[PDB]
């Protein structure tokens, strides 16, 4: 009634718990129980349920306990179902809670957890079991520190550890598998038009003071480690942190991505260094770049398109400049028209240079980079109605490296970028 929360200082487990213990190695002959892998089925899930279904601090072990396997090191099914309820807990925060569960289990001595969803497997060492380690302690570690780290979104946490083969398969099909569907569909089907607030990150201003990253569902961070959902949860967990809400109010230009509020909130975060910005263009007031970007796209005027190059690529681009040479001017939080540093996932987005013609402006990519995004790039270009194999039209390092050679290759290929209106 008074919204009073009492904190628990000590994790009630006999085995020592510390961040230092992760990354250890259990001897191949000193394992006790190996749950999961290709050996048996193991899975994990964090649920956002109503307060009725979640009872605070309930740890349930369904099936044989660790004390039952007295024989040689063997395998048992493992099911870790975590139910979480809170006043402001939503389904978008479930992946954040589940990601941290990997490090929660690794912090325990003799317990190492690697994997996500149904691809997980946890091995228990002899050292923990002889010290009274049980499957009930697994739920004590999660519950004690789920309330600790997520103390502003998690009111009650209920953990069930399932190790019965019959129940482990059954609960996966009604809770785990259906909820993985929602995660994939939410990430794939979310576009900029549907959302109403963008997010701004400024964690790279330690070396690029003028740099502000605007994160949208179709345009994640330059480093590639921050997305719209991640920034949404960062703002909730850390209201005064690097990620802050950016209202999408006031639309100067829909095609170029100009918004009245975005320009207002960019000049504030960058301390007035950058005042006008666009989200879907690289020529008119482009976004700034810090230096964490793995791929940088540069304009190639003679080909009526743009060239791309990844960080690992150590050769010379058709632009005449390598990645290091291009990174010396694109980075640093300066607005350089015609050049943009971005992530590896933004390549196959429908907002990749929407205001500059679209995705078809790509004319040259590294061979290793082209293969990675070939499946996604071809699908996105299919919406442009051209033949599906768009990557086949894109030139690579193997075919040519000089500007006059690649232009000839584009002439014969019927590349769409040539026929489009002049980019510059």
């Amino acid at each position: 009634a008074r919204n009073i929360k009492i904190k628990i200082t000590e994790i009630p487990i006999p085995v020592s718990f510390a961040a230092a213990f992760e990354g250890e190695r259990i001897r191949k002959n000193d394992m006790l129980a190996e749950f999961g892998g290709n050996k048996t089925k193991a899975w994990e899930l964090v649920m956002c349920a109503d307060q009725g279904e979640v009872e605070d601090h309930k740890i349930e072990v369904i099936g044989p306990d660790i004390d039952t396997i007295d024989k040689a090191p063997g395998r048992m099914p493992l099911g870790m179902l975590i139910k979480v309820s809170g006043t402001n807990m939503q389904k978008d925060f479930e992946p954040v809670l589940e990601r941290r569960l990997h490090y929660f289990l690794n912090y325990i001595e003799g317990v190492m957890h690697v994997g996500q969803r149904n691809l997980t497997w946890v091995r228990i060492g002899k050292e923990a079991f002889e010290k009274g380690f049980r499957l009930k302690h697994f739920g004590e570690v999660i519950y004690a520190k789920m309330l600790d780290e997520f103390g502003s979104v998690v009111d009650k946490c209920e953990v069930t550890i399932i190790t019965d083969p019959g129940k482990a398969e059954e609960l996966e099909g009604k809770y785990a598998v259906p909820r993985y569907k929602e995660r994939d569909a939410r990430l794939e089907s979310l576009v900029d038009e549907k959302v109403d607030t963008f997010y701004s990150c400024n964690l790279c201003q330690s070396f690029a003071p003028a740099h502000v990253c605007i994160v949208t569902p179709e345009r994640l961070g330059l480093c590639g480690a921050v997305s719209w959902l991640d920034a949404k949860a960062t703002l909730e967990l850390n209201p005064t942190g690097p990620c802050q809400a950016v209202p999408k109010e006031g639309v100067v230009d829909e095609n170029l991505g100009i918004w009245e509020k975005v320009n207002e909130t960019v000049s504030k975060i960058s301390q007035g260094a950058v005042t006008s910005v666009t989200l879907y263009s690289i020529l008119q007031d482009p976004m700034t770049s810090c230096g964490c970007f793995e791929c940088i796209t540069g304009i190639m005027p003679e080909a009526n398109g743009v060239v791309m190059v990844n960080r690992e690529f150590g050769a010379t681009t058709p632009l005449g400049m390598t990645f290091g040479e291009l990174a010396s001017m694109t980075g640093g939080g300066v607005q350089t028209p015609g050049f943009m540093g971005h992530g590896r996932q933004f390549i196959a987005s429908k907002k990749f240079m929407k205001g500059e013609g679209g995705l078809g402006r790509i004319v040259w990519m590294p061979k290793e980079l082209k293969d990675f995004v070939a499946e996604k790039l071809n699908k996105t270009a299919k919406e442009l109605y051209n033949i599906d194999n768009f990557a086949d039209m894109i030139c690579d390092e193997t075919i040519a490296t000089e500007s006059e050679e690649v232009v000839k290759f584009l002439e014969e290929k019927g590349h769409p970028a040539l026929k489009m209106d002049p980019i510059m």
């Binding site: 964690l203 330690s206 301390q271 007035g272």
Partner: protein, 313 residues
Amino acid sequence: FKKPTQKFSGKIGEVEIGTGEKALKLGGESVLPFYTFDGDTGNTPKVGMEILDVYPEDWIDPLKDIYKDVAKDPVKWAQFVEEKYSPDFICLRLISADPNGTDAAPEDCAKTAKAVVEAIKTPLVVAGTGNHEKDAKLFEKVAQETEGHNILLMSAVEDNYKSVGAAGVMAYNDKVVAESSVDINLAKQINILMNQLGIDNTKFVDNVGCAAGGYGYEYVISTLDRVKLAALGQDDKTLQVPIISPVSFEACKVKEAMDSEEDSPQWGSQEDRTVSMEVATASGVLASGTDAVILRHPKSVEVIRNFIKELLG
């Protein structure tokens, strides 16, 4: 030509440390430091001297020779510094409280601080240890013992800002230093947390980090430049707070200032290098936007005070 007309919409707030006629004011400037030609430089930057609650064992021999018969007793040490060098403020670093060394209970250290604050007229700045956990308990007892003198509690990081700020500004009506790690965003974050807790800009000063010349110094210079430009140029209300940077803490521990002639014969005198190290470090941070510095060697104070006086008058 055209005289540069640089107009800043911001203005740094004023924080008063101490009580009586010796109380000092920090901040108030609406222009860059020492830019008397641009506008109003609010309050002249202050220079403070550092003392210890224990005998200085690691200080250089020339410093030990100055504080011969007064270093043993902090009360005698504080009165000796005040009457001989007349610093703007005296910094009392509670070395005996750190867990890494001669760890002592917070009650013992607060008793030492109580005697010092009641034996001097100059404002006192009580510097804590490096440990975040101990500083929360240390400052709770220190601020209770030294009540009614408006001391400055130093090194209140994001970890213990709730404990230090509550036991500091709000409870016993003191001042608190909000310390960040050489970042404008981290400095901006800690200030927001203090404001949300109920402490406005007039009750706490900022510490954006400090370093010795040649040891990560440009990082401190960039941070000082950025916070000053944001506070004034961008009228950022969450950065319009005065800045104090302890120079003697970092500048006097380096190899170039502690090595004696026996260790490095070519480097020359030891006292000259110690003074020259603090003067160079303090002058550079003063030009970047620091409103108060802490110095150890008495000769450094005289040079910096002359340095401040020459540029402003």
